[PDB]
């Protein structure tokens, strides 16, 4: 037990923010999911701009976070 958060705790917390934001993002898409039925090979739900933007935003931002975290901690004196 310690009264402070280790760097492991910070990485775990940021990954927790990423997964919780993935859940929040799906909830945001679900709010605008007007139709229940899916595409059939009559209108169909186009892929949400939220999803299409997140497919780049989440991994890229996570990679930037990985760069920042590992650069900050590995090179520390």
């Amino acid at each position: 037990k310690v009264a402070y958060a280790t760097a492991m705790d910070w990485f775990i917390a940021v990954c927790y923010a990423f997964v919780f934001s993935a859940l929040i993002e799906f909830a945001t898409v679900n709010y605008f999911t007007k139709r229940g039925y899916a595409w059939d090979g009559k209108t169909f739900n186009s892929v949400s701009k939220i999803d299409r933007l997140s497919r780049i935003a989440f991994p890229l931002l996570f990679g930037i976070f990985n760069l920042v975290y590992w650069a900050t901690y590995l090179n520390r004196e």
Binding site: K1, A3, Y4, D9, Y16, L23, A27, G36
Partner: protein
């Protein structure tokens, strides 16, 4: 766990079967810190309660999705309560952490019952 607040000394004559004995006692005053318990117990329980909350924004028509979210939430809440109580000794009285986990139980079970009555 704690922080040393201070020390205090006493000297009293205890009576026992073998005679009267002068006993000198040092009380160290310790005050607990909850930061590890927040990141250990309180934060996960609040996050799972928010997971119970997010069920409402999910469409009501999605019966498997709603039911799955509710059951996962309440069952992992049971598991979290079990481990949190494992952190404690075996004592027969409800503590503050037990009160918080009980309220979290009420919330997650209420969300599941809310979808049950909604359907």
């Amino acid at each position: 766990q704690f922080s040393f607040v201070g020390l205090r000394n006493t000297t009293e004559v205890v009576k026992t079967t073998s005679g009267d004995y002068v006993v000198m006692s040092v009380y160290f005053d310790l005050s607990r810190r909850m930061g590890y318990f927040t990141i250990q117990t309180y934060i996960p329980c609040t996050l799972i309660v928010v997971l119970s909350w997010v069920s409402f924004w999910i469409n009501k028509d999605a019966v498997p999705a709603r039911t799955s979210l509710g059951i996962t939430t309440v069952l992992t809440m049971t598991t979290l309560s079990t481990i949190a109580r494992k952190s404690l000794p075996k004592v027969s009285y409800v503590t503050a952490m037990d009160l918080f986990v009980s309220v979290c139980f009420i919330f997650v079970f209420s969300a599941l019952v809310e979808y049950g009555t909604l359907h």
